[PDB]
């Protein structure tokens, strides 16, 4: 049933804000990629306006597009 | 909060 997403085909080697960091692109760093508990999109805390400096302890958290 | 590497 592959490829998960159907923007970068899963291909590593591509950017992708679909799938991957949803500012960037950049898939590195995926245990600091946020994961935003309305869109489902992917932050990494670095790429934040303004940065975290650490993921947050939270159980929820909501990207600044969904709050 | 997730990660992508939790998720
Ligand atoms: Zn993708
Ligand atoms: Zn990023
Ligand atoms: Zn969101
Ligand atoms: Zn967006």
Redesign the pocket.
């Known amino acids: 049933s592959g490829p998960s997403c159907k923007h970068c085909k899963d291909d590593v080697n591509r950017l992708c804000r679909v799938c991957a ?1 949803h ?4 898939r590195q760093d995926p245990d600091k ?1 946020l994961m935003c508990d309305e869109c489902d999109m992917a ?2 805390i ?2 934040l306006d303004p940065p975290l400096s650490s993921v947050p302890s939270e159980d929820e958290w909501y990207c600044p597009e969904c709050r | 909060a997730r990660t992508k590497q939790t998720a």
Do not use: K, T, V
């Not at chain 1, 500012?23 to 950049?26: R, S, T």
């Open positions: 960091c500012l960037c692109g950049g990629q932050f990494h670095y790429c």
